[PDB]
Amino acid sequence: SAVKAARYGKDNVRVYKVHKDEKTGVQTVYEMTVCVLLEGEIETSYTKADNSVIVATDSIKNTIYITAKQNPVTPPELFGSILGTHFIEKYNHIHAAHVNIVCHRWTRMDIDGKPHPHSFIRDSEEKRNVQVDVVEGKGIDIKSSLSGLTVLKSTNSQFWGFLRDEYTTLKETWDRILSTDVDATWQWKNFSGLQEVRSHVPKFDATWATAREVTLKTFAEDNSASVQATMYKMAEQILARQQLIETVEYSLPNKHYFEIDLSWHKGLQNTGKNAEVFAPQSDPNGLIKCTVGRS
Amino acid sequence: SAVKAARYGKDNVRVYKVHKDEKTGVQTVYEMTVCVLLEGEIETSYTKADNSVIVATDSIKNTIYITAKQNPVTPPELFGSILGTHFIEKYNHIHAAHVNIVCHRWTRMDIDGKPHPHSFIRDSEEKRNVQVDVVEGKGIDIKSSLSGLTVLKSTNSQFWGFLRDEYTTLKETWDRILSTDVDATWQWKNFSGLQEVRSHVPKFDATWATAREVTLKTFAEDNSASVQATMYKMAEQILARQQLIETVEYSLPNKHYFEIDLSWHKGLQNTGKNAEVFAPQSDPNGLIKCTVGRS
Amino acid sequence: SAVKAARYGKDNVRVYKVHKDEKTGVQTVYEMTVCVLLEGEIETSYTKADNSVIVATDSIKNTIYITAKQNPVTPPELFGSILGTHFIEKYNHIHAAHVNIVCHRWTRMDIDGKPHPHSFIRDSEEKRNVQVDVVEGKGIDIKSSLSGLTVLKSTNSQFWGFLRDEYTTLKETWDRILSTDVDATWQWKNFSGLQEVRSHVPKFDATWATAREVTLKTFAEDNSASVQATMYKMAEQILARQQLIETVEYSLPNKHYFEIDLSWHKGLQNTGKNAEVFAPQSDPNGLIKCTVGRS
Amino acid sequence: SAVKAARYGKDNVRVYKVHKDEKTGVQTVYEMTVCVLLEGEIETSYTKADNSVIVATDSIKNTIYITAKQNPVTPPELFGSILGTHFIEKYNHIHAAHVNIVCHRWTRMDIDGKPHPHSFIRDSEEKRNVQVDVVEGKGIDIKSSLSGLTVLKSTNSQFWGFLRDEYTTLKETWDRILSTDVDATWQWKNFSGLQEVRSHVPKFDATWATAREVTLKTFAEDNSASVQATMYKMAEQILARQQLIETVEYSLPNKHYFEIDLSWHKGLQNTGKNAEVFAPQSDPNGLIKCTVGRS
Ligand SMILES: O=c1[nH]c(=O)c2nn[nH]c2[nH]1
Ligand SMILES: O=c1[nH]c(=O)c2nn[nH]c2[nH]1
Ligand SMILES: O=c1[nH]c(=O)c2nn[nH]c2[nH]1
Ligand SMILES: O=c1[nH]c(=O)c2nn[nH]c2[nH]1
Ligand code: NA
Ligand code: NA
Ligand code: NA
Ligand code: NA
Ligand SMILES: [Xe]
Ligand SMILES: [Xe]
Ligand SMILES: [Xe]
Ligand SMILES: [Xe]
């Protein structure tokens, strides 16, 4: 037997950082969960019990805190690149670092119509994520994402003209509820190293904001022919607005809301044009994916 | 042996309702999860296998949908009272109905600075809840709540002057992070029946909004001496603003963020006035409760 | 305004303890999650910011560890009573302690048909719980429970003869699937204090085992007329076998498995006597409760 | 822009099947959650709103039920292969099916030392999974796994001799607790189609049982030098026992239990050889992966 692949590290490292402006008194908080996995010349720890090649996962945890202390933690694409680069430069036998970061929302509170200097609310479980792969001699690959954005529209969704055969019971419809949890990932062109990532720093927050805006607007405005058709429109627009993105991937559950026929009870009309009360279905759900790239 | 207490019903009934304004084209959605448990002269179903006394839980589910079809579902205090009253009036041998409702957020989307007519976002897992107990000959008892409101302030919290003995290691502090998930419940004076609940309908949404506003403002502005002292201030203000509330209960976890001493590494200073990077603790947590009523 | 009720403490305190037999080499592990809430003369911490009355929740956490170090942690009824008694005896102004303990399963592994001395498996998320209320001058009230015991029988359950009216669609049945998650609680007669709890120590594990055995056997063997009728039989038997129990409470979800009519597809027969493939329903669910006591 | 990759289907389809032996009266139940995603010539549904290429996800759900009705559902490797093959053979323009199956435990109850004919218990949340990729003209690729197997040993784990630098605080140890949740995957050699999968049917259950046995035994008996070294031993043995497996992958969290220094309290000794009470840590955790293949 032989080791074909190996990676190891620390998962679920929760980190909070506060920035205090001494002038204005304004404080800004960041909270993240971080995972760092390393690869390199470490096969002997598995095969020969040679621990001398292991940077202890506890040390990886320490490194995340120290790096957060000495560097900006925003945008997460930059923090992840700094963190990954550290391990490949510091340890001769480590040749790749894989850094995943989940950013949690702490939104400044508005009290009496003015922004509060040091009080925050978690408005939704929506996350902003990054995956950063730093590979010695191959640069830095960054995938940025938003996840956990849950939306619903109550009309202006249709689904008709699909394949009908002996397995089909679904009725065609020209007016349905559409609801989904959005997972959208944009993959950056490969960067040569930290200097290049630093040179593009302003684009990271701007592209996240654009991806979010395009997703929300397209969903709200498209008279949707299917989840497939609407999601493609979103991806197309993101690629048009940021030339440094190579691909856009969406993964979308179709969370079904079923009509309830109440006609058995006193002829009550609750279907088609008369539908008012629906039953949300926890499962099963449609799952629709697509990756869109450039011609 | 004897049956001392018994209740039975249907839990986790998910309900969505849409309202369509034919004039403006504006649609508004409501989504809830409902539980209804009944009590009454049903002991024989347990002791003698006499199913003739059982209103099937499947029928309870049907009733929730039918009631939602024929009545407003907002405010939830009114819907719960209608639903509970139905069972005690319809079935001679049922003498109490217990209705719990969890309302999920569907917030209208703003697209290009204007409210969209039929598109919604789930902004946070904060819930608005009601518990309604309808007891034949004893009226309607309603407890209203908000839950899952998660907040953090990065300064203006202190904790000193607590009891110190041989079990104590905690250091006194004049500047700490305070973060909690707010669960706040206000209990209404007993109502004689549906007519009286209907007469107070405008107060339900207004009091929920007030409870939310008072909680957020007090948390943000109080230079907190403890969770205990800050929560009391919140409860006091709610009781002052709505005379029809008899008691206010808060249950608050104290979600700890620990300093990380980094001085072992190159004398790095990250404690006290120099603290920037903290470790959020998933567990354990403080849990602080209080029920405040009128003199 | 006035404080009507107040309690505070530490939740989610995870504790592991190991016992090492120096003779046999056998090790036995216990793992629990503990919550301790205190009550007493503490109103001033809420109303006057008087922290001098507060035993810090951090100290409560320390106390749980120290108490686990110096005392047996099994049976949990005894550990909870020791822990609760500590606070009311140690602090003059604390008059009640409420201790909740969840015991997690670590079952000794059998390797090659023999019990391993120091290796364990988590066989199921079933828990054994206790709630202990220690109230100065009123003794010790203990509720013991099992929860998270998930069972299913594929036949020998019926449900017919229930009330039928204009809200009813459910068909009567003489053969259905019955599946539930068992939550069963037995409440002990009040104990005068620790000496009395200590005198009954052997009964705690034995009664837990009996409650478990009676639940499983009755479920498997009863040709069930309803959840109500089967659960009553369980409770009756537990009360008969342990005279020191005053009441038995069961809370049981009815987790539905629906037939799937496939007759639309090539006349395929999958209902009634021909039913083979079913759709488990995540929600809604029936919820059936009963508390049984002595004549 | 262009579609680079696309797949779509139905997730979270819960399925139960019962087998009734008319002779013995014995019933056996199977419960699974199934996901099926399809790929093929479907780009136009995304780019041109051409729904004529879409097999509706609702039809995919119907197909899973019908296939379960007409075929054995065990072993899951066979069921998944039947299900995947159906879609690529039935629909000309569908060229790949990806089938994931999670099998839930329903273990026959022993009542009074004998196996009950129709009553079952969920003993643990351990799952048996399969991933089956059926690709037109490329055969059937099957990955089998077990997950959610949670174990702990209280001694006979060590960790010393790791890299020490200015980021390191971890002390070397010769006696620690080791606890993990096991995720183990074995990848079968590619099969040419259903006939070949059918010919190997007896190997699937046997190899699952062997993988489980080897994991448990090795964990219990190895005087572990690290998670890395112990996991390699497991993988090596599985590859030796089943020649039709090409690779074995393990992914193992290292769930930490920390010593608690109690010496501040009356000189209480609870560290090193005196350690009895530990604090389980919910996060962070080590994460250790390896893929082992043949020379
Ligand atoms: O078994 C271990 N492997 C590791 O890589 C490690 N790092 N810290 N502790 C550890 N334990
Ligand atoms: O056992 C049952 N009890 C009930 O109360 C009920 N209601 N619907 N189905 C049911 N099954
Ligand atoms: O606000 C607080 N209240 C308390 O009771 C407490 N105990 N430890 N820390 C604390 N903080
Ligand atoms: O938008 C949809 N896409 C699909 O593929 C599908 N299948 N059933 N319903 C559906 N709705
Ligand atoms: Na390197
Ligand atoms: Na009545
Ligand atoms: Na006392
Ligand atoms: Na095909
Ligand atoms: Xe952070
Ligand atoms: Xe609703
Ligand atoms: Xe414990
Ligand atoms: Xe199944």
Contacts of A5 in chain D (CB under 8 A): 289-291
Residue C202: CA count within 13 A, CB half-sphere: 0
Which chain B residues have a beta carbon less than 8 Å from that of C58? Answer: 168-170
What is the number of alpha carbons within 13 Å of residue B150 lying toward its C-beta?
Answer: 14
Cα D289 to Cα A13, A41, B67, C255, D152: the distances in Å are 18, 14, 54, 37, 18
Written as six digits, the tokens of C173 are 């049945």
- Tell me how many domains chain D contains: 1
Residues of chain A neighbouring D10 (CB-CB closer than 8 A):
284-287
Q: Are D78 and D86 in contact (CB under 8 A)?
A: no
Q: How far is the CA of B173 from the centre of ligand 7 (A)?
A: 27
Q: Return the bridge partners of D245, or none.
A: D188
Q: What is residue D274's DSSP assignment? A: G
Distance CA A232, CA A178 (A): 16
In short, whether A15's Cβ falls inside 6 Å of ligand 9 is yes
φ, ψ (nearest 5 deg) of residue C285: -135, 150
Catalytic site includes residue C28 = no
Question: Burial, B190: exposed, middle or buried (Cβ in 10 Å; 0-12, 13-18, 19+)?
Answer: middle
Which chain C residues have a beta carbon less than 8 Å from that of D270? 69
**Residue of C57, C74, C210, C247 marked catalytic:** C57
Span from the CA of A264 to the centroid of ligand 4 (angstroms):
29
- Strand bridging mode A114-121 / A178-188: unpaired
- Looking at residue B188, its amino acid is W
Q: In terms of DSSP H, where are the helices of B146-259? A: 194-199, 201-221, 227-241
Q: Give the closest residue to B86 by CA, choosing from A280, C166, A279, A271.
A: C166
**C-alpha span between C156 and C229 (Å, rounded):** 13
Chain C residues near residue B13 by CB distance under 8 angstroms:
283-284
How far apart are alpha carbons A209 and D29 in whole angstroms? 50
**Other CB atoms within 10 Å distance of the CB of residue B14:** 19
CB C193 within 8 A of CB C200: no
The CA distance from D295 to D289, in Å, is: 19
| Residue D170: count of CB within 10 angstroms of its CB | 16
Q: Which of A28, A44, A57, A74 is catalytic?
A: A57
State the ligand closest to the CA atom of D68. Answer: 12
Residue in D223, D261, D276, D281 to test binding to C, most C beta-carbons within 10 Å: D276
Question: To test the ligand 4 pocket, which listed residue (D54, D55, D60, D87) has its Cβ within 8 A of the most ligand atoms?
Answer: D54
Taking the CA atoms of B144, B148, B154 and B157 in sequence, report the sign of the dihedral they define. positive
Query: Do A83 and A64 touch, CB atoms closer than 8 A?
Result: yes
Q: What is the CATH number of the domain that holds B35?
A: 3.10.270.10
CB distance C170 to C106 below 8 Å: no
- Which one of the ligands is nearest to D279 CA? 11
Q: For residues C69 and D270, is the Cβ–Cβ distance under 8 A?
A: yes
Residue found under tokens 């090492």: C20
H or E stretch covering D130:
strand D127-135
**Distance from C-alpha of A114 to C-alpha of A94, rounded to nearest angstrom:** 49
- Tokens at residue A251, please? 């993964």
Cα nearest neighbour of B286 on chain C:
C10
8 Å CB contact between B151 and A122 = yes
* CA-to-CA dists, residue B282 to A12, A14, D136, angstroms: 11, 9, 48
In angstroms and rounded to an integer, the radius of gyration of the C-alpha atoms of chain B is: 24
Check: CB of residue A249 under 8 Å from CB of residue A230.
no
Closest of C169, C165, C206, C171 to residue C186, by C-alpha: C206
Question: In whole angstroms, what is the distance from residue A13 CA to residue A16 CA?
Answer: 10
DSSP D170: P
Is A86 in the active site?
no
Q: What's the CA gap between A39 and A95, in Å, rounded?
A: 6
Query: Are the beta carbons of D154 and C220 separated by less than 8 Å?
Result: no
**Structure token pair of residue B124:** 């946070």
Cβ atoms of C162 and C204 within 8 Å: the answer is: no
Whether residues B277 and A125 touch (CB distance < 8 A) is answered with: no
Q: Which of D57, D74, D210, D247 is catalytic?
A: D57
Interchain CB distance below 8 Å, D169 and B266: no
Ligand 3 in contact with C56 (CB < 6 A)?
Answer: yes
Other CB atoms within 10 A of residue C76 CB: 25
> How many CB atoms are located within 10 Å of the residue B123 CB?
15
Residue keyed to tokens 């990954």: A84
Query: Which is the catalytic residue, given B28, B33, B44, B57?
Result: B57
The SS3 assignment for B69 reads helix
Q: Which residue of A has its CA nearest to D294?
A: A1
Helix (H), strand (E), coil (C) string for D224-250: ECCHHHHHHHHHHHHHHHCCCEEEEEE
The stretches of chain D forming alpha helices (DSSP H) are 43-47, 57-70, 76-90, 194-199, 201-221, 227-241
Find out whether B3 is annotated in a ligand binding site.
no
Rounded Cα distance, A209 and D173, in Å: 48
The total number of residues shown for chain A amounts to 295
Q: What angle do CA D42, D47, D52 make, to 5 degrees?
A: 45
CA distances from A167 to C153, D68, D91, D93 (A): 31, 14, 12, 16
Cα(C2) to centroid(ligand 3), Å: 21
Residues with CB under 6 Å of ligand 11 are C 15-17, 30-32, 68, 73
**3-class DSSP state of D43:** helix
- Subunit contact A112:B217, Cβ cutoff 8 A: yes
According to DSSP, residue D48 is labeled: S
CB D186 within 8 A of CB D144: yes
Q: How far is Cα D269 from Cα D277, in angstroms, rounded to an integer?
A: 10
Structure tokens at D78: 């066979």
What residue in B sits closest to D165 (Cα-Cα)?
B265
Contact of A11 with D261, CB cutoff 8 Å: no
**What span, in angstroms and rounded, lies between the C-alpha atoms of A265 and A263?**
5
CA C40 to chain centre: 27
Q: Which of D265, D282, D283 sits opposite B166 (nearest CB)?
A: D265
**CB–CB contact D169 B264 (8 Å):** yes
Q: Which residue has the tokens 């405010």?
A: B75
CA of C159 to the centre of ligand 2 (A): 7
- Give the distance (Å) from ligand 9 centre to CA of residue B123: 23
Q: Return the HEC string of A44-65.
A: HHHHCCCHHHCECHHHHHHHHH
* Residue B55 DSSP class: B
Handedness of CA C280, C283, C288, C289 (dihedral sign): positive
Residue C94: which residues within 8 A CB-CB, separation 6 or more?
C38, C39, C40, C41, C42, C55, C87, C88
Burial (CB count within 10 angstroms: exposed 0-12, middle 13-18, buried 19+), residue A163 = middle
DSSP state of D273: G
Which residue in the block uniquely carries the two structure tokens 């996901």? D35
A95 is catalytic: no
Measured between CB atoms, which of C31, C120, C153 is closest to D119? C153
| Per-residue 3-state assignment (H helix, E strand, C coil) for chain A | CEEEEEEEEEEEEEEEEEEECCCCCCEEEEEEEEEEEEEECCHHHHHCCCHHHCECHHHHHHHHHHHHHHCCCCCHHHHHHHHHHHHHHHCCCEEEEEEEEEEECCEEEEECCEEEEEEEECCCCCEEEEEEEEECCCEEEEEEEEEEEEEEECCCECECCCECCCCCCCCCECCCCEEEEEEEEEEECCECCHHHHHHCHHHHHHHHHHHHHHHHHHHHHCCECCHHHHHHHHHHHHHHHCCCEEEEEEEEEECCEEECCCCCCCCCCCCHHHCCEEEECCCCEEEEEEEEECC
Contact at CB, B167 and D265, closer than 8 angstroms = yes
- CA dihedral (B163, B165, B169, B173) in degrees, to 10, reads 30
- Whether the CB-CB separation of B135 and B68 falls below 8 Å is answered with no
Q: Which ligand is nearest to the CA of B180?
A: 3
D209 burial (CB, 10 Å; 0-12 / 13-18 / 19+) is: exposed
Burial class (CB in 10 A: 0-12, 13-18, 19+), C123: middle
Burial label, D197 (beta-carbon count in 10 A; 0-12, 13-18, 19+): buried
Show the DSSP H helices in B122-226 as ranges.
194-199, 201-221
Calculated CA dihedral for residues D112, D114, D116, D117, nearest 10 degrees: -150
D266/B166 touch (CB, cutoff 8 Å), yes or no: yes
Residue C282 makes CB contacts below 8 A (sequence gap 6+) with: A282, A283, D14
| CA C46/CA C48 separation, integer angstroms | 6
Q: At what angle do helices D201-221 and D76-90 cross, to 10 degrees?
A: 140
Q: Which residues of C touch B8 (CB under 8 A)?
A: 228, 286-289
User: Hey, is D165 helix, strand or coil?
Assistant: coil
CB within 8 Å of A247: residues ≥ 6 apart: A186, A187, A291, A292, A293, D4
Q: Which residues contact C262 (CB under 8 A, 6 or more apart)?
A: C268, C269, C270, C277, D65, D66, D69
| Residue C69: closest C-alpha in chain D | D277
- Compute the distance between CA of residue D87 and CA of residue D220 in angstroms, rounded to an integer: 44
Other beta carbons within 10 Å of C283: 17
Q: How would you write chain C as a 3-class SS string?
A: CEEEEEEEEEEEEEEEEEEECCCCCCEEEEEEEEEEEEEECCHHHHHCCCHHHCECHHHHHHHHHHHHHHCCCCCHHHHHHHHHHHHHHHCCCEEEEEEEEEEECCEEEEECCEEEEEEEECCCCCEEEEEEEEECCCEEEEEEEEEEEEEEECCCECECCCECCCCCCCCCECCCCEEEEEEEEEEECCECCHHHHHHCHHHHHHHHHHHHHHHHHHHHHCCECCHHHHHHHHHHHHHHHCCCEEEEEEEEEECCEEECCCCCCCCCCCCHHHCCEEEECCCCEEEEEEEEECC
Task: Fill in the DSSP letter of residue B239.
Answer: H
Assess contact for D225 and A51: CB atoms under 8 A.
yes
Q: Return contacts of A68-74, CB within 8 angstroms, 24+ apart.
A: A68/A15, A68/A17, A68/B277, A69/B262, A69/B268, A69/B270, A69/B276, A69/B277, A70/B268, A73/A15, A73/A17, A73/A30, A73/A32, A74/A30, A74/A205
**Could you give the count of Cα atoms lying within 13 Å of C211 in the half-sphere of its Cβ?**
27
Nearest ligand for residue B257 CA: 3
Whether A104 lines ligand 9, by a CB cut-off of 6 Å, is no
CA pair distance A254, A285, nearest whole angstrom: 6
Residue D46 distance to chain C (closest CA, Å): 30
Q: Which two tokens stand for residue A295?
A: 């011609």
Cβ atoms of C251 and C286 closer than 8 Å? no
Instruction: State the Cα–Cα distance between residues B238 and B218, nearest whole angstrom.
Output: 11
- CA–CA separation, C27 vs C108, rounded Å? 10
Rounded to 5 degrees, φ, ψ at A100 are: -115, 135
Give the mutation candidate from B34, B118, B224 for the A interface (greatest A CB count, under 10 A). B118
Sign of the Cα pseudo-torsion (C274, C276, C280, C285, in order): positive
Does the distance separating the beta carbons of C279 and D65 come in below 8 Å?
A: yes
Q: Could you list the residue range(s) of the whole structural domain that residue C61 is in?
A: 1-295
Closest-CA residue to D169 (of D294, D258, D289): D258
Measured on CA atoms in the order D179, D181, D183, D184, is the torsion positive or negative? positive
Give the CA distances from residue D207 to residues B44, D185, D197, D202, in Å, rounded to whole numbers and listed in that order: 52, 11, 14, 9
Residue of D nearest to B283 (CA): D282
- The DSSP letter of residue B261 is -
Tokens found for residue A110: 């508005």
- CB contacts of C123 in chain D (<8 Å) are 123-124
In whole angstroms, what is the distance from residue A22 CA to residue A26 CA?
Answer: 8
Q: Does the annotation flag B26 for ligand binding?
A: no
C-beta B32 within 6 A of ligand 10: yes
d(CA B210, CA B218): 12
List, in order, residues 6 or more apart from C27 with CB less than 8 Å away.
Answer: C18, C19, C20, C21, C117, C118, D154, D155
The Cα–Cα gap between A5 and A16 comes to 33
Least CB–CB distance from B280: residue in A14, A118, A216? A14
A–B CB contacts, 8 A cutoff, strictly below:
153
Structure tokens at C162: 């229930």
d(CA A184, CA A204): 15
Phi first, then psi, for residue C234 (nearest 5°) are: -65, -50
Of C236, C185, C215, residue with least CA distance to B3 = C236
Is cis: bond before B284, omega within 30 of 0? yes
Pairwise CB contact (< 8 Å): D292 & A12:
no
d(CA C83, CA C89): 10
How far apart CA B51 and CA B111 sit, in angstroms, is 55
Separation CA C265–CA C267 (nearest Å): 5
Q: What phi, psi does C179 have (nearest 5°)?
A: -145, 140
Distance CA B163, CA C52 (A): 5
Closest CA to B215 of B181, B247, B244: B181
Helix axes B57-70, B76-90, angle to 10 degrees: 130
CA distance A150 to A171: 26
Sign for the pseudo-dihedral over CA of D201, D205, D208, D211 = negative
